[PDB]
A paper describes a structure:
Prostate-specific membrane antigen (PSMA), also known as glutamate carboxypeptidase II (GCPII), folate hydrolase (FOLH1), or N-acetylated α-linked acidic dipeptidase (NAALADase), is a membrane-bound metallopeptidase, featuring two zinc ions in its active site. Importantly, the PSMA is overexpressed on prostate cancer cells and the enzyme thus attracts significant attention as a target for the delivery of imaging and therapeutic agents and continues to serve as an important biomarker of prostate cancer. To identify molecular mechanisms behind markedly different potencies of bisubstituted sulfamides and phosphinates/phosphonates, we solved X-ray structures of complexes between PSMA, a well-studied bimetallic metallopeptidase, and sulfamide-based inhibitors. Structural data showed that while monosubstituted sulfamides coordinate active-site zinc ions via the free negatively charged amino group in a canonical manner, their bisubstituted counterparts adopt an atypical binding pattern divergent from expected positioning of corresponding tetrahedral reaction intermediates.
The N1 functionalization of 9 has a significant negative impact on the inhibition potency, resulting in IC50 values of 103 and 165 μM for 3 and 4, respectively. The use of the hydrolytically inactive PSMA(E424M) mutant was required due to the fact that upon cocrystallization of 3 and 4 with the wild-type enzyme, the inhibitors were hydrolyzed and only the hydrolytic products were observed in the PSMA active site (data not shown). Similar to the PSMA/9 complex, the P1′ glutamates of 3 and 4 are well-defined in the Fo-Fc difference map and they occupy overlapping canonical positions within the S1′ pocket. Interestingly, the placement of the sulfamide functionality differs between the two compounds. In the PSMA/4 complex, the sulfamide function is rotated by 120 degrees. Consequently, the positioning and interaction pattern of the first sulfamide oxygen is identical to that of 3, while the second oxygen atom is rotated to the position of the P1 nitrogen atom of 4, where it is hydrogen-bonded to the catalytic water/OH– (2.7 Å), Asn519 (3.1 Å), and Asp453 (3.2 Å), and at a distance of 3.4 Å from the cocatalytic zinc ion. Finally, the β-carboxylate group of 3 forms ion pairs and the hydrogen bond with Arg536 (3.0 and 3.3 Å) and Ser454 (2.5 Å), respectively, while the γ-carboxylate of 4 is disordered in the structure pointing toward its positional flexibility and the absence of strong interactions with residues of the enzyme. At the same time, given the expected conformational flexibility of 4 in the crystal structure (as witnessed by the weak Fo-Fc peaks for the P1 moiety of the inhibitor), such a rearrangement can be plausible.
Residue numbers in the entry:
A (entry chain A), B (entry chain A): 55 to 543, 548 to 750
The structure:
Amino acid sequence: KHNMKAFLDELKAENIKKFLYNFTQIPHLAGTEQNFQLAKQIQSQWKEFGLDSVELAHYDVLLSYPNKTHPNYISIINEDGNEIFNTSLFEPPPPGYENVSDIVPPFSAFSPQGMPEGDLVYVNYARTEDFFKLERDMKINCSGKIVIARYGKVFRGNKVKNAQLAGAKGVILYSDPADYFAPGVKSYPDGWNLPGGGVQRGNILNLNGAGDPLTPGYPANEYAYRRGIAEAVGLPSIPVHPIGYYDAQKLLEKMGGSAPPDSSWRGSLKVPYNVGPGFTGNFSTQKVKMHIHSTNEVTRIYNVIGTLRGAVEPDRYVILGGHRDSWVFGGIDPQSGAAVVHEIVRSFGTLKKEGWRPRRTILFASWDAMEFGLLGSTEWAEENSRLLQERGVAYINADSSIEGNYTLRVDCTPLMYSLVHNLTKELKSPDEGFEGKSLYESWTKKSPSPEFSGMPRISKLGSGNDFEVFFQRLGIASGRARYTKNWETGYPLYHSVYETYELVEKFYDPMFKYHLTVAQVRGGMVFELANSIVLPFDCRDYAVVLRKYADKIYSISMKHPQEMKTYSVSFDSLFSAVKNFTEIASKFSERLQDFDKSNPIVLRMMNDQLMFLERAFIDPLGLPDRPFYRHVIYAPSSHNKYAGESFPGIYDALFDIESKVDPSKAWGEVKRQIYVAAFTVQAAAETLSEVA
Amino acid sequence: KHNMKAFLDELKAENIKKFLYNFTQIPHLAGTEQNFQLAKQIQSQWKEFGLDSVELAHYDVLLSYPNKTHPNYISIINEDGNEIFNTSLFEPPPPGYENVSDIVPPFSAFSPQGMPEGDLVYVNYARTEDFFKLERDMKINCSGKIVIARYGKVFRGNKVKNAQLAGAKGVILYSDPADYFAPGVKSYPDGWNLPGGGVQRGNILNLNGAGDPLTPGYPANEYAYRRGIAEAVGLPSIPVHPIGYYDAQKLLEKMGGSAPPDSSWRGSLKVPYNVGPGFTGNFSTQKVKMHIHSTNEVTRIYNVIGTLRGAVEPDRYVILGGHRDSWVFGGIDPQSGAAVVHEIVRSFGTLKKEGWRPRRTILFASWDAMEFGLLGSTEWAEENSRLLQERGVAYINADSSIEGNYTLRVDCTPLMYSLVHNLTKELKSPDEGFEGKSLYESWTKKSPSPEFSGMPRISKLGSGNDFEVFFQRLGIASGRARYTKNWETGYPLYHSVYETYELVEKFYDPMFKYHLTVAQVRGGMVFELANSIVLPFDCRDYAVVLRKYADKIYSISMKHPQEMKTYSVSFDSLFSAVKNFTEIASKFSERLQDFDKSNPIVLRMMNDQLMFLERAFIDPLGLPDRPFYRHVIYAPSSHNKYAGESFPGIYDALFDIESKVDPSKAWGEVKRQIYVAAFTVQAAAETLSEVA
Ligand SMILES: *[C@@H]1O[C@H](CO)[C@@H](O[C@@H]2O[C@H](CO)[C@@H](O[C@@H]3O[C@H](CO[C@H]4O[C@H](CO)[C@@H](O)[C@H](O)[C@@H]4O)[C@@H](O)[C@H](O[C@H]4O[C@H](CO)[C@@H](O)[C@H](O)[C@@H]4O)[C@@H]3O)[C@H](O)[C@H]2NC(C)=O)[C@H](O)[C@H]1NC(C)=O
Ligand SMILES: *[C@@H]1O[C@H](CO)[C@@H](O[C@@H]2O[C@H](CO)[C@@H](O[C@@H]3O[C@H](CO[C@H]4O[C@H](CO)[C@@H](O)[C@H](O)[C@@H]4O)[C@@H](O)[C@H](O[C@H]4O[C@H](CO)[C@@H](O)[C@H](O)[C@@H]4O)[C@@H]3O)[C@H](O)[C@H]2NC(C)=O)[C@H](O)[C@H]1NC(C)=O
Ligand SMILES: *[C@@H]1O[C@H](CO)[C@@H](O[C@@H]2O[C@H](CO)[C@@H](O[C@@H]3O[C@H](CO)[C@@H](O)[C@H](O[C@H]4O[C@H](CO)[C@@H](O)[C@H](O)[C@@H]4O)[C@@H]3O)[C@H](O)[C@H]2NC(C)=O)[C@H](O)[C@H]1NC(C)=O
Ligand SMILES: *[C@@H]1O[C@H](CO)[C@@H](O[C@@H]2O[C@H](CO)[C@@H](O[C@@H]3O[C@H](CO)[C@@H](O)[C@H](O[C@H]4O[C@H](CO)[C@@H](O)[C@H](O)[C@@H]4O)[C@@H]3O)[C@H](O)[C@H]2NC(C)=O)[C@H](O)[C@H]1NC(C)=O
Ligand SMILES: *[C@@H]1O[C@H](CO)[C@@H](O[C@@H]2O[C@H](CO)[C@@H](O)[C@H](O)[C@H]2NC(C)=O)[C@H](O)[C@H]1NC(C)=O
Ligand SMILES: *[C@@H]1O[C@H](CO)[C@@H](O[C@@H]2O[C@H](CO)[C@@H](O)[C@H](O)[C@H]2NC(C)=O)[C@H](O)[C@H]1NC(C)=O
Ligand SMILES: *[C@@H]1O[C@H](CO)[C@@H](O[C@@H]2O[C@H](CO)[C@@H](O)[C@H](O)[C@H]2NC(C)=O)[C@H](O)[C@H]1NC(C)=O
Ligand SMILES: *[C@@H]1O[C@H](CO)[C@@H](O[C@@H]2O[C@H](CO)[C@@H](O)[C@H](O)[C@H]2NC(C)=O)[C@H](O)[C@H]1NC(C)=O
Ligand SMILES: *[C@@H]1O[C@H](CO)[C@@H](O[C@@H]2O[C@H](CO)[C@@H](O)[C@H](O)[C@H]2NC(C)=O)[C@H](O)[C@H]1NC(C)=O
Ligand SMILES: *[C@@H]1O[C@H](CO)[C@@H](O[C@@H]2O[C@H](CO)[C@@H](O)[C@H](O)[C@H]2NC(C)=O)[C@H](O)[C@H]1NC(C)=O
Ligand SMILES: *[C@@H]1O[C@H](CO)[C@@H](O[C@@H]2O[C@H](CO)[C@@H](O)[C@H](O)[C@H]2NC(C)=O)[C@H](O)[C@H]1NC(C)=O
Ligand SMILES: *[C@@H]1O[C@H](CO)[C@@H](O[C@@H]2O[C@H](CO)[C@@H](O)[C@H](O)[C@H]2NC(C)=O)[C@H](O)[C@H]1NC(C)=O
Ligand SMILES: O=C(O)CC[C@H](NS(=O)(=O)N[C@@H](CCC(=O)O)C(=O)O)C(=O)O
Ligand SMILES: O=C(O)CC[C@H](NS(=O)(=O)N[C@@H](CCC(=O)O)C(=O)O)C(=O)O
Ligand SMILES: *[C@@H]1O[C@H](CO)[C@@H](O)[C@H](O)[C@H]1NC(C)=O
Ligand SMILES: *[C@@H]1O[C@H](CO)[C@@H](O)[C@H](O)[C@H]1NC(C)=O
Ligand SMILES: [Ca+2]
Ligand SMILES: [Ca+2]
Ligand SMILES: [Cl-]
Ligand SMILES: [Cl-]
Ligand code: NA
Ligand code: NA
Ligand SMILES: [Zn+2]
Ligand SMILES: [Zn+2]
Ligand SMILES: [Zn+2]
Ligand SMILES: [Zn+2]
């Protein structure tokens, strides 16, 4: 039989292992020849695996690279201007790769050039609340200072934005062992911990969903008109560079000025964690000097797009996509995901060769330049936006398959909660102590829902991955799944040269059983979405979460009862819309289960109602000053791109409102956001009403 | 049989006459009790006629009314401040209506209050080119002057915007007999000409598609947050008032300063048409003083929405809509259209009572507050935007059925050209000298295509009517049809108290045969759109017009050959996209005619490709500073809302470019608009490619 069981049984751990090894022997940095060669390889293999068509979609986008003959580094300088300490020019390469060419040294992609000299201020994680504490409570002024911040907690672009708005003239990012060194585990290559010479790469853009900085709204094709750099979206205005903790120790050890305000500001290095500004009395005349010479360059990138045409609804698209470009070897990020996608294509192709076709079209994507701002997925979606918004059923992401070996982690739209519960009940747990038990059972046990006994945790989609354009801009139901660590006990070698095949094979998943389980979850989800007669979405699950989010946003507002009285701030409209959504979704579910099952139009009709429900939460005017974040329920946090925020428009209107100079205007805007949210929820509910 | 013939034969001239009489006995001004009563009447009658549901959709929108106890008027004042001439406080009411209550006196809706005193400048039609001539050629300065402008040529809101930007402190609008008095025809009530005491009402907003000035983007429902007046969209900043030509004679006769620059600046009054500024030497110390006391008020409006549920595709909507609100009696505008809609509903209801149903759902709308800025249609479409953009097949407008008795006038999307040609070949010409011949034959003879021998003229959609939100904001295929005058030989009594049932019955259409013909065209179009198995759109007709528009915009640019060389301005991408559109549409047409006719999915698929083709020309970012004009091919002219402009983004980038101070920046923006247009055309073409 050709059913989901046939598809799932065909997936093999050993194939994922072979593919991972194959994709991780050399660096695949976006815009390089090596990454074009791998694109062409994947194109060829997807054809052989049996897809109907496989094309490269290329774009010319702004990328960023260090100058090979003018290295980036940081110095301590004395009053003579002698550089008495210099940070490393590269990470010590791992065993057996000390002769690999074209390893890009650690840098912050899209940093401007500069050689700023100044006194250091230590800003903890450089979060919004960290700068509030510095400025408001401690009365420390970052204006004209170089800030040093530890990685962690929030996306690094938000740290740089926060540092900029505090008036910093430069940012040094470093990995603190408190955040990137698990107690009792050995450093690479003897364990999975970050060594002191390890450094996390990564872009520091604030794109807010725009894609290529030079072509917001439109694909960066051959005839594109590009903005000048001065008008580009999202570029930092101050120099930025990342370092490891050996180097960070040398910059922090001399820090004077104020003491850390409390213990949440101290990492694990043998230093005081003084906030500064500047060094202690003896070294008070030494300063920190950055040297950044990286250049921004328009460079060609290549997405691989494979199509498996649907037998019945060829004009309905289920998309499985993840990126291919890596900072260096990409042993976890992204090749642990890409190898899983490759094995999924191979399985689907096996069934197709035997005469099977999915009901709906499946599109498979190998995205480029994800590490430089989600550029490949975003430019392709800008090119194909009309096809995607009228035909896109769902998008399943496929970055790193593993970030630990403890349990499953799923982030998705509420529309997929039921699908995920049902699929995981069918799958075998790969976990020790759960042999012969379902993935649902092990997952629920290890990651209980905070709300419901007997169910597992499923999180909101945030951002920082290739689902962003599909979900937050276009309103296509999206989901992701991977294996994760026990958060009670990211990963230490994230975006370092040490992320290698050997890291995965030795320390994370020697038997490739977690990879296989993630292939089963991602592939199983795609199979159902592409093959179920009725789309496998449950609108009632959206109604439940909308009430939770309405309760939450109301509670935030109600911390200001006087102002709500003074400005007549009511949430009644939003609760009314949520109540209506609950009632209409209940009735729609009855019709879906009860409609005449022989009628394909009532079924195309009701499948269209299911497909366009996520779409209904899109506001074509976007959120304030963020035109490409259009989903009214979910946006990336304005304080942390990685985190999702619910009712983001109301949330941002309320954030720090007690500090606004004109409360009447501020609370007016809260009321405006309540109106927009209530309207959008009611409008989405009405898409599920009887159509005429 | 239940076919289009059955539908068409059921329509009766005598019923349209009875309905017109019924709808025109009392004024139906938006926001008044009389207009609510008529809404309730139409709701009741549409139910009795047999529609499945008929509801009122109400909104609370900004309207504008004169102060009943503080009348608007204009004076000439002497240096003592005696008012030696005053304009009329009302139009002399027509015979038999001198006792009708609640006739709103002539006013310019949305004028601010004020009593500005100054010297007059005469600005011809107050068009962009008229102000260019005043300022650039004649060196006349309007700053701090009261401008007097004759109605005609362009929408009055554009005149007021132009006057404002010239620094005018007030605007007087008047009807010149050159533009509103046909030679050899008698004034009302003895003929169809405007008498000297007649005045044209009308709003002077510049909404650019926004709808209610206080709630752009969102319906003005019960919980709406409204902008303050200071932030409202589209309101004029200087006082404005309309007058007739008896009064205009008194204001113009004393005008001094410069002579008219040529004969195109002189109307038909016995005055010099001096541009001013100010009066001749003897009267040089007299000034003009406006007194405007109208108030803006949020007021409830009511749309009637009737539904005839489709038998096969209930989730596909064909909409027939036109407005119900009038300035006074609405004898032509809009009741000649509303009576036609009423008879169309009655016919459809007759077939429905006999057991018939259309294939797709038909929605019928009686819009409110159209005269105050398309407010009723726009607020309803804002409320229902998600349903309309995923389910809207087509919108057929139904304002005034007649503006003359000469021949047919059709403005529509190219997608409907074939439908209109084929339907009119089936219909009987009502014209004298064409008995027994088709409407197509009489129409082609009297209104030949400027491009193609043997075919009739069909114009682009402009704006200024209720199709605007559906077509230019949401991208739903739209059309309109009415009987019109011979443009070789609008209508004189437009928006005056003299627009009555008697005007129509005596002078325009005594036998109601032109009304019946227009009912046949509008109803026939709705019938086909709602009933044809394959939607009756021909994508190849879009390809033909896109090449015409590309040629036209290229020609405009090529008036600047040096600059095109200097800034490397190429139209190659746009011609390439148009060529591709032509090729793909040709192949799609072959599949449509050749596909397996027994396959309803290939048919729903290909019907969806046809429905979403107009949708593909929408840019979600809108046009520059006009977020609600989103169609890249068609926008209302930025110089005249009534006129359509093709490739509006490129057109506006090129307009008056030789006057821009920074040519590099100006031509950069031309290139950006070429990129956006070429991309959008290619993207629309790709929606017609095979789907997978
Ligand atoms: C959740 O779902 C419910 C429906 O189950 C919606 O209920 C609607 O709520 C609105 C209030 O926001 C009601 O609006 C009121 O309508 C009255 C007229 O309604 C009748 O006629 C209309 C046609 O015009 C029909 O649509 C309707 O079926 C009724 O037959 C108005 O008279 C009311 O205005 C008066 O009172 C208010 C309040 O004091 C004043 O501000 C006004 O000045 C005026 O005096 C009012 O506008 C509406 O009738 C309800 N529809 C129903 C019950 O079907 C909720 O709105 C929805 N929630 C959201 C967020 O959309
Ligand atoms: C109208 O329809 C036609 C298709 O019939 C489109 O034609 C495309 O035109 C673009 C130019 O805008 C061509 O782009 C060129 O692609 C080359 C690679 O193409 C091959 O491989 C790709 C995958 O990456 C496949 O998609 C494709 O099928 C080919 O197999 C590039 O090498 C070219 O770049 C080089 O030359 C240019 C020009 O000098 C330089 O600027 C670059 O630096 C580089 O050296 C170029 O990008 C594309 O191949 C054409 N596709 C075809 C023929 O199928 C038109 O674009 C379309 N019109 C519009 C407005 O969309
Ligand atoms: C995840 O799995 C759960 C559990 O299987 C699943 O919920 C179940 O879905 C089925 C199918 O819709 C439900 O069965 C329906 O029950 C009602 C009431 O008993 C019946 O009226 C329905 O009968 C109609 O449809 C049948 C075909 O399904 C026809 O055979 C019949 O002639 C009728 O037309 C129907 O049997 C069942 O109640 C639920 N169980 C629950 C909710 O506990 C859920 O849908 C899955 N989630 C997905 C797929 O996303
Ligand atoms: C306006 O009217 C014109 C004139 O009637 C109309 O164009 C015509 O449309 C018909 C129907 O599509 C065309 O007929 C087709 O001709 C091709 C080539 O000869 C045939 O291959 C097609 O046959 C297929 O489809 C038939 C059903 O229509 C089946 O019976 C058959 O088995 C095949 O599947 C088909 O007969 C005809 O060529 C044109 N005439 C022209 C273009 O001159 C136009 O569509 C109308 N516009 C509308 C409705 O908007
Ligand atoms: C990854 O696997 C691919 C596919 O097997 C290898 O590419 C093949 O290389 C052989 C030998 O050079 C060629 O004959 C084939 O034409 C290639 N197939 C392709 C590109 O489709 C590739 O060598 C492997 N990479 C590594 C690093 O081992
Ligand atoms: C990268 O840095 C190198 C080395 O400093 C730069 O190459 C020099 O450029 C200057 C002019 O800008 C020349 O006068 C030198 O002769 C060059 N030196 C070498 C070693 O080639 C180069 O400008 C930088 N590359 C960039 C900005 O991409
Ligand atoms: C840090 O690196 C800098 C730059 O390479 C070193 O300073 C240079 O040293 C050479 C020879 O001693 C001088 O000729 C250059 O003029 C110096 N350049 C600058 C910018 O200072 C410095 O010696 C290094 N410091 C350490 C501790 O190795
Ligand atoms: C932090 O220090 C800078 C000075 O280095 C302050 O920035 C000044 O702001 C005032 C106006 O508010 C201007 O007159 C100065 O020109 C600014 N200085 C420069 C050179 O930019 C800033 O106000 C301080 N932050 C505090 C304590 O609020
Ligand atoms: C327009 O026609 C309507 C419908 O016939 C008339 O309204 C009817 O009036 C009669 C007598 O007052 C009532 O018995 C009916 O209930 C009304 N029908 C409705 C409102 O549906 C109306 O009087 C006519 N208007 C004019 C000006 O003649
Ligand atoms: C319309 O004009 C009338 C008449 O001038 C205004 O009514 C007067 O309002 C003032 C205060 O604004 C009172 O002191 C007078 O007693 C009122 N007179 C009358 C005749 O009632 C009224 O303000 C205006 N209405 C509006 C603005 O809608
Ligand atoms: C034009 O109308 C104005 C306002 O009604 C008239 O001027 C008023 O006349 C009365 C009595 O003569 C005075 O008490 C008022 O003070 C006047 N008001 C103003 C604002 O001037 C004027 O007489 C009328 N002119 C003509 C030609 O009839
Ligand atoms: C038309 O006349 C007005 C003066 O009445 C001019 O407007 C002035 O513009 C200059 C700056 O360009 C300012 O200094 C004045 O304050 C403005 N006047 C007022 C009172 O607004 C205008 O420039 C003239 N137009 C021409 C001839 O270009
Ligand atoms: O540019 C972006 O939006 C992010 C690009 C890249 N995305 S990622 O894959 O490396 N981010 C993690 C987020 C880490 C976490 O929150 O656990 C992920 O999605 O796995 C980065 O953060 O540099
Ligand atoms: O607010 C608007 O956009 C226009 C409202 C109203 N529309 S209209 O129906 O009166 N305009 C005419 C345009 C007259 C013409 O161009 O022949 C029409 O569409 O018939 C008006 O112009 O005041
Ligand atoms: C793999 O699982 C074991 C058992 O809990 C754990 O001790 C080890 O740290 C895990 N490896 C990684 C890389 O998380
Ligand atoms: C009606 O048609 C006749 C014949 O051409 C024409 O003379 C007359 O002016 C028309 N009436 C109107 C109102 O246009
Ligand atoms: Ca782009
Ligand atoms: Ca509105
Ligand atoms: Cl992922
Ligand atoms: Cl019309
Ligand atoms: Na493109
Ligand atoms: Na609403
Ligand atoms: Zn990454
Ligand atoms: Zn990644
Ligand atoms: Zn009108
Ligand atoms: Zn009208």
